[PDB]
């Protein structure tokens, strides 16, 4: 029979395995022989303590680099408040060594783990581009637990070179199968932040991952949005357990928190999936997550069923990741048809938003053209609008099949008068639906205030396939 890890803290890793079936169901993947062998994962953060007793065994210099100091050594900069422990903590969750009598184990405890030190300094466009595009043919999965300020006031995303890096990696990485970029959705919950205002998580090139507390509740730091794909467990209130992993100074922590703990756990699970089928494309992987994730036991007030019968939530995407199911479906999986991209201009003539605005448009989804789509994947609602108090706006997109995606919820701390400039709000909630039909965009002032503004552009970009 299969033998579970003997590491001292493994029992404390309630999210990997527990008496209750409230876990990531990784044990079932391990039993089938999937533990990460041959898979390379890189943590883009503040560095990795490569000689950590629970990381050294899986450390991979080839998946590492120090972009901040233009050097190959990713060792973090030590400070008394351990400010740069972030990367090390994430590394351990992906691939901490198993059965070595130290701390716990990573989801993919036999995978190779590397680290890119790129947050300990000025994080320029070039820095992000070099990090995202580091060893595209050696590193299979990139895990990024960072993003724009989570103050609930900012709208920012990758710049020119980083945007190029993303598409380049998804096109040429892994010998053409595409790099897999796993992202933490954000910790601005308390500020009522929206992850659709984060161009990294909102990107179609990344698998944005949210968190769920031990008792299956929406964490206090959780940001809701339609671009989130799936969820993994993480920290919660003072009465719920947290994540166990490798900490700076060769220590072991049982209190890692936030969505930063969720992304690497997802990367680990995705590493197991790749072992089970090394030929999965970056899109194949997102399809597997959508089909195998489980809403079950995850409490939220917004679970809704979309046009193809799947339950989705703005707090959890399609639900909790299921290592077992992921690995199972990966084996019997046929790579998806080529990606089509249908661009449709909904309105080019301005409209006063005022108190409420509704835009309806019949869409044929490029019928009769090479980009005709009948099965959706990502959906972008590209808006350009001006408003006096941005945070007062709430924007919704309804698919022909009736799936209502909240592109933007009110952000009480956002007082910007800058509006949006071709911002691509993205939704994963209509995945697999037929896009043909009438789409509806809703923009409303959630405040009693006398706000005003104009929607000047609305481009619907549909990604997907045809049978």
């Amino acid at each position: 029979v299969y033998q579970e890890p003997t590491d001292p803290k493994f029992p404390q890793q309630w999210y990997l395995s527990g008496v209750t079936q409230r876990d990531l169901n990784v044990k079932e993947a391990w039993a089938q022989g999937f533990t990460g062998h041959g898979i390379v994962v890189s943590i883009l953060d503040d560095g990795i303590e490569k000689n950590h007793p629970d990381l050294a065994g899986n450390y991979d210099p080839g998946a590492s680099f120090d972009v901040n100091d233009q050097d190959p050594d990713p060792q973090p900069r030590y400070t008394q408040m351990n400010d740069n422990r972030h990367g090390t903590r994430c590394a351990g969750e992906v691939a901490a060594v198993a059965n070595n009598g130290v701390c716990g184990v990573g989801v993919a405890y036999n995978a190779r783990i590397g680290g890119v030190r790129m947050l300990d300094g000025e994080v320029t466009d070039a820095v992000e581009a070099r990090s995202l595009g580091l060893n595209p043919n050696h590193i299979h999965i990139y895990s990024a637990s960072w993003g724009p300020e989570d103050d609930g006031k900012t709208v920012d995303g990758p710049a020119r070179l980083a945007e190029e890096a993303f598409f380049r990696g998804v096109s040429q990485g892994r010998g053409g199968l595409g790099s897999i970029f796993v992202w933490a959705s954000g910790n601005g919950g308390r500020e009522h932040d929206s992850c659709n205002c984060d161009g990294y998580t909102n990107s179609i090139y990344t698998l944005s991952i949210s968190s769920a507390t031990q008792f299956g509740n929406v964490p206090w730091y959780s940001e809701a949005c339609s671009s989130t794909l799936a969820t993994t467990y993480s920290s919660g209130n003072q009465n719920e357990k947290q994540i166990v992993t490798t900490d700076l100074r060769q220590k072991c922590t049982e209190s890692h928190t936030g969505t930063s703990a969720s992304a690497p756990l997802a990367a680990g699970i995705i590493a197991l999936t790749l072992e089970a089928n090394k030929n999965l494309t970056w899109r194949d992987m997102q399809h597997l997550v959508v089909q195998t994730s489980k809403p079950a036991h995850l409490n939220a007030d917004d679970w809704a069923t979309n046009g193809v019968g799947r339950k989705v939530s703005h707090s959890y995407g399609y639900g909790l990741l299921d290592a077992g199911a992921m690995v199972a479906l990966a084996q019997n999986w046929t790579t998806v048809a080529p990606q089509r991209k249908c661009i449709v201009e909904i309105l080019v003539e301005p409209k006063d938003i005022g108190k409420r605005l509704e835009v309806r448009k019949a869409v044929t989804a490029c019928l009769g053209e090479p980009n005709h789509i009948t099965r959706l994947e990502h959906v972008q609602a590209r808006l350009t609008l001006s408003y006096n108090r941005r945070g007062d706006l709430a924007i919704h997109l309804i698919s022909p099949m009736g799936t209502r995606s909240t592109l933007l919820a009110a952000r009480p701390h956002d007082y910007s008068a800058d509006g949006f400039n071709d911002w691509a709000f993205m939704t994963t909630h209509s995945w697999d639906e037929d896009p043909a039909g009438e789409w509806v965009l809703e923009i409303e002032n959630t405040s009693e205030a006398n706000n005003y503004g104009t929607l000047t552009k609305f481009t619907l970009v549909l990604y997907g396939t045809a049978p």
């Binding site: 953060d45 503040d46 972030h86 947050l119 994080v123 992000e128 637990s145 960072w146 993003g147 724009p148 300020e149 989570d150 933490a184 954000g186 910790n187 936030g258 969505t259 930063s260 992304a263």
Partner: peptide
């Protein structure tokens, strides 16, 4: 850019 902030760590999460």
């Amino acid at each position: 850019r902030v760590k999460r």
